[PDB]
Ligand binder design. Structure first.
Ligand SMILES: C[S@@+](CC[C@H](N)C(=O)[O-])C[C@H]1O[C@@H](n2cnc3c(N)ncnc32)[C@H](O)[C@@H]1O
Ligand SMILES: [Zn+2]
Ligand SMILES: [Zn+2]
Ligand SMILES: [Zn+2]
Length: 213
């Protein structure tokens, strides 16, 4: 029962990273076929996508994934046993691959708290990641499919914080290759917000830490 958005909705804050990542220097290819910014390009080293208007690789680069909204067209929602809904791929996924950007209403730490008691009173799930400087990305009412990814103590994905054109945004990247049909997951510990609301983890894992978060 959420509203589908294609981009973050900035409520009362601004996640300005404060660092103008420019001149990624990594050289441009030669074949339209292949890509431009290998596993290098000085920018990707400080998790800062390249500003289109300067990247040596022109329109055919690969470190602007979050900007160009280059999400994977495979994710499929589905009923996860004792975890309600969940997301999974229909196409395999090499590791380190950009999977999708995590959207929502980016709000302050206090703006969220209020929502946490003023509206998310009688609520079961927890939809929001830590963004930066207390600012949070709330997705209880708005966001995309990522809001549907479950937690695992042995994640196959990691949420990463990148400076995009001067604004911190969060993308979901794979940690390990995955066979089609595999459910995407990430560790809510260093990413998801902090509310003493707790739940038993149906992670289904050997050394599972027992509790979410
Ligand atoms: C943002 S939602 C993920 C989508 C959700 N499964 C649904 O049906 O709408 C987060 C909630 O899903 C459930 N969940 C996600 N991962 C879980 C896990 N490993 N174990 C148990 N519950 C999980 C918990 O209620 C948690 O608060
Ligand atoms: Zn570069
Ligand atoms: Zn670039
Ligand atoms: Zn677990």
């Amino acid at each position: 029962s959420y509203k589908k958005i294609r981009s973050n909705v900035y409520v009362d804050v601004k996640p300005l990273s404060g660092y103008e990542a420019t001149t990624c220097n990594c050289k441009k290819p030669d074949d339209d076929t292949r890509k431009g910014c290998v596993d290098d390009c000085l920018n990707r080293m400080i998790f800062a996508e390249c500003s289109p208007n300067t990247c040596p690789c022109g329109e055919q680069c690969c470190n602007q994934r979050i900007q160009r909204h280059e999400w994977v067209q495979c994710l499929e929602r589905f009923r996860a046993e004792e975890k309600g809904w969940g997301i999974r791929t229909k196409e395999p996924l090499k590791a380190g691959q950009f999977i999708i950007e995590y959207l929502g209403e980016v709000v302050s730490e206090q703006e969220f708290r209020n929502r946490m008691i003023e509206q998310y009173h009688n609520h079961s799930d927890h939809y929001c990641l830590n963004l930066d400087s207390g600012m949070v990305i709330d997705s209880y009412r708005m966001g995309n499919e990522a809001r549907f990814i479950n937690h695992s103590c042995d994640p196959n994905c990691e949420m990463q914080k990148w400076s995009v054109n001067g604004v911190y945004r969060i993308g979901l990247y794979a940690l390990k290759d995955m066979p089609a049909g595999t459910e995407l997951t990430y560790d809510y510990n260093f990413h998801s917000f902090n509310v003493e609301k707790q739940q038993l983890c149906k992670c289904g894992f050997e050394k599972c830490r027992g509790i979410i978060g």
